[PDB]
From Swiss-Prot:
Annotated organism of origin: Neurospora crassa (strain ATCC 24698 / 74-OR23-1A / CBS 708.71 / DSM 1257 / FGSC 987)
Pfam families: Ribosomal_L32e
Entry similarity comment: Belongs to the eukaryotic ribosomal protein eL32 family.
A GO molecular function held by the record: structural constituent of ribosome
SMART domains: Ribosomal_L32e (SM01393)
Keyword Ribonucleoprotein: yes
SUPFAM superfamilies (alphabetical): Ribosomal protein L32e
Main subcellular location: cytoplasm
Keywords: Cytoplasm, Ribonucleoprotein, Ribosomal protein
Record protein name field: Large ribosomal subunit protein eL32
Length: 121
RNA sequence: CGUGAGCCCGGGUCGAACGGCCUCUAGUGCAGAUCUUGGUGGUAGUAGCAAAUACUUCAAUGAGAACUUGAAGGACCGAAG
């Protein structure tokens, strides 16, 4: 599986956290752009957090590829996993939650016949 | 996984509903407003519990007695009490 691709180079493997999200408990860790008039992060002072922008974008050839080389497709049926019959070299099944224990077995059983990778077997 | 808002999965709890996609709709996104309501801290076992002179012994009750009771002693209000 995972036919062939250029090496998956990630320009930044960390992520962006909100300014002062570590000091205050009311401030979530999800990124929000600092819009204050005196904010040091927004003014890009040396030694502060970085802001998300294009330029950190991933290569288009490897944009949504997991490290194996597949792209994740959410599957919740035996009929849904059969959509990847022709794309088993580029897409990998990912059994969503809410799928009962019995239906999970059938999806694993069928995706094995199709030689489709399952990311949460 | 995505530059990002976010999305997805595994593990634990739980017990009755829920989601994707295309359109339509809105009381639709919070860190502040000496914001509103509710809850909780440090301070902190901290400030303090110091006016009106004052209590002590024995016994009983009782799981437990300085401020319950009886007896004895010592005091105060001192009749515009
Ligand atoms: Mg019920
Ligand atoms: Mg509103
Ligand atoms: Mg809110
Ligand atoms: Mg708030
Ligand atoms: Mg306030
Ligand atoms: Mg004290
Ligand atoms: Mg005092
Ligand atoms: Mg008189």
């Amino acid at each position: 599986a995972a036919k062939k691709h250029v090496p998956i180079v990630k320009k930044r493997s960390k992520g962006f956290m909100r300014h002062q999200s570590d000091r205050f408990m009311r401030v979530d860790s999800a990124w929000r752009k600092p819009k204050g008039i005196d904010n040091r992060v927004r003014r890009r002072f040396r030694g502060t957090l970085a802001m998300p922008s294009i330029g950190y974008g991933s290569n288009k050839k490897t944009r949504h590829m997991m490290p194996s080389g597949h792209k994740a497709f959410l599957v919740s049926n035996v009929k849904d996993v059969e959509l990847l019959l022709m794309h088993n070299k580029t897409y990998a099944a990912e059994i969503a939650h809410n799928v009962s224990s019995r239906k999970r077995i059938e999806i694993i059983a069928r995706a094995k016949q199709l030689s489709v990778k399952v990311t949460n077997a």
